From a paper:
Central to the replication cycle of influenza viruses is the viral RNA-dependent RNA polymerase which transcribes and replicates the viral RNA genome. The influenza virus RNA-dependent RNA polymerase is a heterotrimeric multifunctional machine composed of polymerase basic 1 ([name]), polymerase basic 2 ([name]) and polymerase acidic (PA) subunits, that catalyzes both primer-independent replication (vRNA to complementary RNA (cRNA) and cRNA to vRNA synthesis) and primer-dependent transcription (vRNA to mRNA synthesis) in the nucleus of infected cells. [name] houses the polymerase active site, whereas [name] and PA contain, respectively, cap-binding and endonuclease domains required for transcription initiation by cap-snatching. High-resolution structures of the complete viral polymerase from a number of human, avian and bat [name] viruses, as well as influenza B, C, and D viruses have been determined. These structures have revealed that the polymerase is a highly flexible macromolecule that can assume a variety of distinct conformations, enabling the polymerase to perform both transcription and replication that require different initiation and termination mechanisms.
Using cryo-EM we determined the structure of 17 polymerase-nanobody complexes at resolutions between 4.5 and 6.7 Å; this is sufficient resolution to accurately position each nanobody bound to the polymerase heterotrimer. The most populous binding site, termed site 1, is on the PA endonuclease with five nanobodies (Nb8198, Nb8199, Nb8200, Nb8203, [name]) that bind at an interface formed by the short helix α1 (residues 1–10) and the long helix α6 (170–185).
Author numbering:
A (entry chain A): 1 to 716
B (entry chain C): 1 to 249
C (entry chain B): 1 to 185, 207 to 756
D (entry chain F): 1 to 24, 33 to 51, 63 to 102, 113 to 123
The structure:
RNA sequence: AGUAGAAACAAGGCC
RNA sequence: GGCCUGCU
């Protein structure tokens, strides 16, 4: 039958009908009479629509061939011959522009004169039944319907026929051409009734070929095919198989509970080796401040001018000389770098306006100090294979180092009060609710407690230094840059003040990965002689740069004044995390506020004021040789703030591992102290897990010592 | 006019012609998401790192013909170098602030009508009345509650057809909404937003947010009302209760 | 006196101050170089935990595979992957018996979803291993490349737009003699059957960074695109199953997890009378993923899908069949340094099979020597067990089956147990009349776990009396206690954009106040610090200050120009009006009534060249990877302002041979923008159909010109011009 | 697409000969009064075998029908066809 | 040298 | 010496 559509109809219509065939997903080889019927429907749609044009009037202009002009409007514009999505697109667009009603089924054409749709259907059966059939299929329709049938008859409601009658003679001539051409073909044994509305399909997902063999190799050891295994599974029913293997399984497979008593836990062993060194990016306990007493705010001002003005406030400069060498570098380079920094600072002082940011010369001194041109050149393996020295990067456990007493004192003095306010908080919306007033009063109390704390000063120092370093690295990637360490505080009298700890020289910072390292050299003034705790300054070079006179009742001290100079490095991640050190304030004060709220849930009243003023209640916050010492809530605030600050400063994988594996043991010990009969399956394994995190970090070793002390004081 | 004209210009060049011809409508989404740009793992680190560069943000090419290349002192506002995989050009953040001090101005009177949820929140809070804070242990029990206080009793898909018919009346397809509540919602949000020119996509998104009901599991103590859950952070705490009555009531 | 914070625990219980034990204020550990060492170590460890299995050689991939299932029962407490098929089938049968109708229903909904799912659902995924280029690429890019290759090779069933048809094409590709791929350096290369099989069965290995809570780094894996559809269907089934199990806690959030934990502890302890003792085990499973054999997941799913259409069973079984034969790419490689000659070199991992061992240290030398026998075409066969939690939900199902197997109806003894399982972590409440009963119950639970290939970490687990325990960093002590140290890293600028960052910060403060019991004063301090960091990050200072920045001039002139300066946004150098009462309001709407109409109009102008919206999914959704958890998405309330710009892209593609991808990106985006202008609903609802672009665009041009004349700007001249231009593009597409 | 022009019809005696042509498979059919249209020859009905011979010149698109030994039973209108297009029909009266 | 820690950075590639 | 890139 398909030979007929090969022969007669034009290409355009046959591929339109083929795409309509693909539309609903049925195959053309099984039933083709539908293809012919609907392609004839589509053909009558065209032949009825084309050759029919309109101009600004009604009364369509009919031309056998559209002449070249702007007057190519089509009388009837076709609906079908398009995908369902576009057919409904045209339906909705016509409804929204023509203000007509939206039909629920697919029309075939639209006309302007009568401003409505045409649903053309030419069926094998006579018209006077198919018409009202499709009419009762369509609900309350104003779209006019018109149908032909092979006998040659026409019909329509309203007795309406919308265009010329010679066109309809055309239609029925086409119709009988179709008819008495099948006459030569002979199809009416099924042509009248060939489609009955079949819609059914079964989804087929068959495993075959290579993928089947893979299925045959992904079974238990004693199975040969997926078919057999699935049959076995379907036939499988529970018949007490877990019990049999449990009985047969060796009894050494057990989870015996070892009781956890007061005498069970042993102190954590600390590693032994050379004392632990300093790792901070700046001096914490041995910092010195040169000040100007200016009225500018933290960010307000220009760095270089402030630094120069602060440094001019000090008199007593001496020619620098080596006091304590780096022990691994070239100290003369550090000396020359310091003198170069001074010289270029003067050079800025001379000229017209202090630059906002200064670049330094790339001398051999800072080329060595900043580690320039030291990365091995990257080459290909095929060119370097016979080199005996060629091997992997050194990948082994870090060097072992024992704890020293300097970190303990540094933390002790990091929780001490100061003679300045190191936090100038921002603005918030004016409090409107009583709860907001309570929150503001609490916040004011904590700010009064923690602002005068060395932890806040360290927070500001780190934030400013890391912000400046990151910005300089991102801006001046190539050229070495000078950045004075600046921090602005407020005195007890209320006068604002600036403080200059020293200088940082940032080097080449072409940082691609988050782990890539930018090297800088840090110089900081101090008065602490490095000849008393040399092991804490393994990586520092310390010079003697001047003498300071601070008013004291013992005449006047006239102390020496040294310069701690070192080469340090950071990374994008480290800079970003060090510039978010202000969340240590959060951590600490959230803990304290949780304490206050928990206690106030007992007594139905806010308990902040008496906690902060009466200072009756105290918490164990340290141990003295006499015994455990307790301090007021403010001291707890400062201690927790210092702990968070040191966590942010000495952060490392060792800290994370020890924190987790020691929190586990802390929970076990707490369960013991709560009389909850705690038990363990392998306590030695937990101890070994904790002890492997303690390698060389001073902070984690101090935490381990604190944990041992807590165990000793606990378990009683 | 224009649209078909850049269509013809695209089809003029062979590669885009092939892309238009062989690519089917269904694959639309795939090729639209086809990109070499990986999704950032650490957005904060790079936002703090990129903002230290010059020309850290991106803007459409049209910026080159509305904002001058430099400001009064000569600080550059935009660059003509296009982004990696787009025709947009990289520009400095000042071009934002500049646009807020001398850029073109319009009538933003209809934004309150579009962003109905947020302005309703503001109105509800502005007329609220606070009360005394009572300090006592709160037994916070976890419950499933509806957070959206303006949901019109419609699901995501249920209101999606409404949203299309309100914004994209022609792409609705087969669906013609039966429920009369949807009829009235369509009528109201059609006559209300008849000429709003913010964007079809944002209008649809905000209509989805407003009409679609959404639910989440939260620790609550008292309240349980939609209007009382948006301020759950302000009325309920660990050891304190703050009596509150939104402006709606 | 020496200060010691830990001594604070002598007065404050450990859980009431547990936040102090979370050093989440410093930089988390990161990996620096290759992850090849970790990948090799994981492969060797997975293969040696199942050493007593039986060896075979796959006839298709030619790789050695180790099957330990039904192997000898363990005789020691060391980890073992010798799961027994009959035991696990019986466990699943008991799970079904205790929950009748679970499998049949879940299979019904899964069948519905599978037969109505679309291909585009695969684009909604993070990095995936594209085999066309042998590298990780965004899910959409890899899917597009694979579809292009399939269409070039003759597999065009995916044009039906159905994920099931895409999987049919994927499987049909397995039986092809020779496929063709494209490489740029374009060159067409031919892949034989075995090479393509291994490329489709392989995984890409990387090192996990930003992982807090352990000293050593780990390795993670990413699969290809051929196997992700089957994984999606299997995980859909597993999620539908677990949603019907109250003992599971994987498909829920955190608060739901806490609620279920409280309910189970109350149920276990309350029902226990005075005579019965109760004990809670806070258990962690050692080597959870390395001991889960994909064959056992195949067994579980084929038991689940019993009495179901065979096509459903086949499509759900394809995934574990491929995992059982999965291969793993070793990794980036190894970098060597020579200090004598002062140079460095980078050898790819694919050379580990043949490269001499003189360059490697003792540990790496031994690892390579042990893993070499499993090396096939630069990748190692990893049949014995899963690599990194790809089947999280099925593992949770197995754990829930173990938990339910002690409902006192199967124990047949006075003791019994229950609890909650979330993959790699569990809490087990066991009750028994005497300590001997508790010991016997825990011993039998451990033994049954060892029969299913699941091991309990004795070093990271402990048992106490009920009332105090831990679960996924949630510490329960007669009621869950807030931590607030897990969410600390999320208190900074997110890094999306100005408005997005502001809204996300305020919303995070609000949420942590609601959930994590953040205090009022602490919340105010957090708001202040966040505002400070936000202003210092975006160079948007108050405007009344003299802080010179790259943006302080325009901000200052805008400040001096504005009359009501209280309405200026913090992004434009205005005061901050936020407070505890205003944390749930966007900044634009909070300052709407205070803004000057000129500034208000300039700010919220639709014609701004900065705002760009792509799809309904990416309107106000921000992907923030939370600390100590999987990547998560958040809805943030924000108004589309001129500050909603999107930041610059990487731009490093210009120096790589893969430079043509940018031109393809630009052309695809131009075509997509044209289509959207032709089809406005393209973004909100993704278009569907089987026609091509130009057909729809030209036909809609026809119709829209027509109707927009029937009322609108068009004119006959223009309408006819459009009609004949449509004809012109038609004849152009003809040729 | 094709137009068909017949020639050579008319009046002939029993036993006589007549030659039809058609200027344009191609073929000749006939219809007698009150009878259906029957095939004569294409490029043979059993009735005309050994009596009528058809030939085709593709160069000039012409299909001649030579009819010999004509009988009263061969009285009909004869029509040319092309594959279906039809000529107007030419009378043959024996 | 320095940062850092089971492998890396201490710029890369292209002419 | 000149120019390109900074998660590809």
């Amino acid at each position: 039958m398909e030979d007929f559509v090969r022969q007669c109809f034009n290409p355009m219509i046959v591929e339109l009908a083929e795409k309509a065939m693909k539309e609903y997903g049925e195959d053309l080889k099984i039933e083709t009479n539908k293809f012919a019927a609907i392609c004839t429907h589509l053909e009558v749609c065209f032949m009825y629509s084309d050759f029919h044009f309109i101009n600004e009037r009604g009364e369509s202009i009919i031309v056998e061939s559209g002449d070249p002009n702007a007057l190519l409007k089509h009388r009837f514009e076709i609906i079908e011959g398009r995908d369902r999505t576009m057919a409904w697109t045209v339906v909705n667009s016509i409804c929204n522009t023509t203000g007509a009603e939206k039909p629920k089924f697919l029309p075939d054409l639209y006309d302007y004169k009568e401003n409505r749709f045409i649903e053309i259907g030419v069926t094998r059966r006579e018209v006077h039944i198919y018409y009202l059939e499709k009419a009762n299929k369509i609900k309350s329709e104003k779209t006019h319907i018109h149908i032909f049938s092979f006998t040659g008859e026409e019909m329509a409601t309203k007795a309406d026929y919308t265009l010329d009658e010679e066109s309809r003679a055309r239609i029925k001539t086409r119709l009988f051409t179709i008819r008495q051409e099948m006459a030569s073909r002979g199809l009416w044994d099924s042509f009248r009734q060939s489609e009955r509305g079949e819609e059914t399909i079964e989804e087929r997902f068959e495993i075959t070929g290579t993928m089947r063999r893979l299925a045959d190799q992904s079974l238990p050891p004693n199975f040969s095919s997926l078919e057999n295994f699935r049959a076995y599974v379907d036939g499988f029913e529970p018949n007490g198989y877990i019990e049999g293997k449990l009985s047969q399984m060796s009894k050494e497979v057990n989870a015996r509970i070892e009781p956890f008593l007061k005498t069970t836990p042993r102190p954590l062993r600390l590693p032994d080796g050379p004392p632990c060194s300093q790792r901070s990016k700046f001096l914490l306990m041995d910092a010195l401040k040169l000040s100007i007493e200016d009225p500018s705010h933290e960010g307000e001002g220009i760095p270089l001018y402030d630094a120069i003005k602060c440094m001019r406030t000090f008199f007593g400069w001496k020619e620098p000389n080596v006091v304590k060498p780096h022990e691994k570098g070239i100290n003369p380079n550090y000396l020359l770098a310091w003198k170069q920094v001074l010289a270029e600072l003067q050079d800025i002082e001379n000229e017209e306006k202090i630059p906002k940011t200064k670049n330094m010369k790339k001398t051999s001194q800072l080329k060595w100090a900043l580690g320039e041109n030291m990365a091995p050149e990257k080459v290909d393996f095929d060119d370097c294979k016979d080199v005996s020295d060629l091997k992997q990067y050194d990948s082994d456990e870090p060097e072992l180092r024992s704890l020293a007493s300097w970190i303990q004192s540094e933390f002790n003095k990091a929780c001490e009060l100061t003679d300045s306010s190191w936090i100038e908080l921002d603005e918030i919306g004016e409090d409107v609710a009583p709860i907001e007033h309570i929150a503001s009063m609490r916040r004011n109390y904590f700010t009064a407690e923690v602002s005068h704390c060395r932890a806040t000063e360290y927070i500001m120092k780190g934030v400013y230094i890391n912000t400046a370093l990151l910005n300089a690295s991102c801006a001046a990637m190539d050229d070495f840059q000078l950045i004075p360490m600046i921090s602005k505080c407020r005195t007890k009298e209320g006068r604002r003040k600036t403080n200059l700890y020293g200088f940082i020289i940032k080097g080449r910072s072409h940082l691609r990965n988050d782990t890539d390292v930018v090297n800088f050299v840090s110089m900081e003034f101090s008065l602490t002689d490095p000849r008393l705790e040399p092991h804490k300054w393994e990586k520092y070079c310390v010079l003697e740069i001047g003498d300071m006179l601070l008013r004291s009742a013992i005449g006047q001290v006239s102390r020496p004044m040294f310069l701690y100079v070192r080469t340090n490095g950071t990374s994008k991640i480290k800079m970003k995390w060090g510039m978010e050190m202000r969340r240590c304030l959060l951590q600490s004060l959230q803990q304290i506020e949780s304490m206050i709220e928990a206690e106030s849930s007992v007594k139905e009243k806010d308990m902040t004021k008496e906690f902060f003023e009466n200072k009756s209640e105290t918490w164990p916050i340290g141990e003295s040789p006499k015994g455990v010492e307790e301090g007021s809530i403010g001291k707890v605030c400062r201690t927790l703030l210092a702990k968070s600050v040191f966590n942010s400063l000495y952060a490392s994988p060792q800290l994370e591992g020890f924190s987790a594996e020691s929190r586990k043991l802390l929970l076990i010990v707490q369960a013991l102290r709560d009389n909850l009969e705690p038990g363990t399956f392998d306590l030695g394994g937990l101890y070994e897990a904790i002890e492997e995190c303690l390698i060389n970090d001073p902070w984690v070793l101090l935490n381990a010592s604190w944990f041992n002390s807590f165990l000793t004081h606990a378990l009683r | 006019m224009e649209r078909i004209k850049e269509l013809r210009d695209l089809m003029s060049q062979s590669r885009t012609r092939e892309i238009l011809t062989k690519t089917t409508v269904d694959h639309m989404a795939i090729i639209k998401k086809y990109t070499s740009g990986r999704q950032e793992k650490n957005p904060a680190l790079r936002m703090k790192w990129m903002m230290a560069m010059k020309y850290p943000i991106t803007a459409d090419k049209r910026i080159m013909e509305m904002i001058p290349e430099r400001n009064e002192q000569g600080q550059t506002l935009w660059s003509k170098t296009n982004d990696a995989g787009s025709d947009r050009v990289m520009v400095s953040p000042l071009a934002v602030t500049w646009w807020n001090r001398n850029g073109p101005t319009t009538s933003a009177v209809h934004y309150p009508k579009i962003y109905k949820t947020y302005f309703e929140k503001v109105e509800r809070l502005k007329h609220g009345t606070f009360g005394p804070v009572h300090f006592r242990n709160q037994v916070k029990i976890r419950r499933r509650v509806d957070i959206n206080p303006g949901h019109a009793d419609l699901s995501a898909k249920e209101a999606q057809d409404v949203i299309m018919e309100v914004v994209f009346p022609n792409e609705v397809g087969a669906r013609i909404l039966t429920s009369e509540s949807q009829l009235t919602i369509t009528k109201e949000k059609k006559e209300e937003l008849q000429d709003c020119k913010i964007s079809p996509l944002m209008v649809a998104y905000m209509l989805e947010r407003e009409l679609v009901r959404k639910t989440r599991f939260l620790p609550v103590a008292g309240g349980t009302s939609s209007v009382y859950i948006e301020v759950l952070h302000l009325t309920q705490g660990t050891c304190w209760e703050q009596m509150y009555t939104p402006g709606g009531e | 006196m020496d200060v010691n914070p830990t001594l604070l625990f002598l007065k404050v219980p450990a859980q009431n101050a547990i936040s102090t034990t979370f050093p989440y204020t410093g930089d988390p550990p990161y990996s620096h170089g290759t992850g090849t060492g970790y990948t090799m170590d994981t492969v060797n460890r997975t293969h040696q935990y199942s050493e007593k299995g039986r060896w075979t050689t796959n006839t298709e991939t030619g790789a050695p595979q180790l099957n330990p299932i039904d192997g000898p029962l363990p005789e020691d407490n060391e980890p073992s992957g010798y799961a027994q098929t009959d035991c696990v089938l019986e466990a699943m049968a008991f799970l079904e018996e205790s929950h009748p109708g679970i499998f049949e229903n879940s299979c019904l909904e899964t069948m519905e979803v599978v037969q109505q799912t679309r291909v585009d659902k695969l684009t909604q995924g993070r990095q995936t291993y594209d085999w066309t280029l042998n590298r990780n690429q965004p899910a959409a890019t890899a899917l597009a490349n694979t579809i292009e290759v399939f269409r070039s090779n003759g597999l065009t069933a995916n044009e039906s737009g159905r994920l099931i048809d895409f999987l049919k094409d994927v499987m049909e590709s397995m039986d092809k003699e020779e496929m063709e791929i494209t490489t740029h350096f374009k060159k067409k290369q031919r892949l034989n059957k075995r090479s393509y099989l291994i490329r489709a069965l392989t995984l890409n290995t990387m090192t996990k960074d930003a992982e807090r809570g352990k000293l050593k780094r780990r390795a993670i894996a990413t699969p290809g695109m051929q196997i992700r559809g089957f994984v999606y269907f299997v995980e859909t089934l597993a999620r539908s199953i677990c949603e019907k199990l109250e003992q599971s806690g994987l498909p829920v959030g955190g608060n739901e997890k806490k609620a279920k934990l409280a309910n189970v502890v109350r149920k276990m302890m309350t029902n226990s009378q005075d005579t019965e003792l109760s004990f809670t085990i806070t258990g962690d499973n050692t080597k959870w993923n390395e001991n889960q054999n994909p064959r056992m997941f195949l067994a579980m799913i084929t038991y689940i899908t019993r009495n179901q259409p065979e096509w459903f069973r086949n499509v759900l079984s394809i995934a574990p069949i491929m995992f059982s034969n999965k291969m793993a790419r070793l990794g980036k490689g190894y970098m060597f340094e020579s200090k004598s000659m002062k140079l460095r070199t980078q050898i790819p991992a694919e050379m580990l099979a043949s490269i001499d061992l003189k360059y490697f240290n003792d540990s790496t030398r031994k690892k390579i020597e042990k893993i070499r026998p499993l090396l096939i075409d630069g990748t190692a066969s990893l049949s014995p067990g899963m690599m990194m939690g790809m089947f999280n939900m099925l593992s949770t199902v197995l754990g829930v089956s173990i938990l339910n197997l002690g409902q006192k109806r199967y124990t047949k003894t006075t003791y019994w147990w229950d609890g909650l399982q979330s993959s790699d972590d569990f809490a087990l409440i066991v009750n028994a009349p005497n300590h001997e009963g508790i010991q016997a119950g825990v011993d039998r639970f451990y033994r049954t776990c060892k029969l299913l290939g699941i091991n309990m970490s004795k070093k990271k687990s402990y048992i106490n009396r009920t009332g105090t325990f831990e679960f996924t960093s949630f510490f329960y002590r007669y009621g869950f206690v807030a931590n607030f140290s897990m969410e600390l890293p999320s208190f900074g600028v997110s890094g999306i954009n100005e408005s997005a960052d502001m809204s996300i910060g305020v919303t995070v403060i609000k949420n942590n106040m609601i959930n994590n019991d953040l205090g009022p004063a602490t919340a105010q301090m957090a708001l202040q610090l966040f505002i400070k960091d936000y202003r210092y990050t975006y160079r948007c200072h108050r405007g009344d200050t003299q802080i010179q920045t790259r943006r302080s001039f325009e901000i200052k002139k805008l400040w001096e120009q504005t009359r009501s300066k209280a309405g200026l946004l913090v992004s434009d150098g205005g005061p901050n009006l936020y407070n505890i009462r205003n944390l749930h309001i966007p900044e634009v709407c909070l300052k709407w009534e205070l803004m000057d109409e000129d500034y208000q109009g300039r700010l919220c102008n639709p014609l701004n060249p900065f705002v760009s919206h792509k799809e309904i999914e990416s309107v106000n959704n921000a992907v923030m990877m939370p600390a100590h958890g999987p990547a998560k998405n958040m809805e943030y309330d924000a108004v589309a302002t001129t500050h909603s710009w999107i930041p610059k892209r990487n731009r490093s593609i210009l120096n790589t041979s893969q430079r043509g991808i940018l031109e393809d990106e630009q052309m695809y985006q131009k075509c997509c923008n044209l289509f959207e202008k032709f089809f406005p609903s393209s973004s909100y609802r993704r278009p569907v159909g089987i026609s091509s672009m130009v057909e729809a665009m030209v036909s809609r041009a026809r119709i829209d010109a027509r109707i927009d004349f029937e009322s609108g700007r068009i004119k006959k001249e223009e309408f006819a011009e459009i009609m004949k231009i449509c004809s012109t593009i038609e004849e152009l597409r003809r040729q | 697409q094709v137009q068909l022009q017949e020639s050579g019809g008319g009046l002939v005696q029993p036993g006589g000969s007549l030659r039809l042509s058609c200027a344009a498979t191609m073929s000749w059919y006939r219809q007698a009064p009150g009878k259906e249209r029957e095939l004569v020859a294409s490029d043979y009905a059993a009735s005309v075998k050994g009596r009528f011979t058809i030939s085709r010149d593709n160069a000039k698109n012409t299909v001649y029908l030579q009819m010999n030994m004509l009988k009263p039973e061969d009285t009909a209108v004869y029509y040319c066809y092309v594959y279906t297009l039809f000529g107007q029909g030419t009378q043959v009266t024996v």
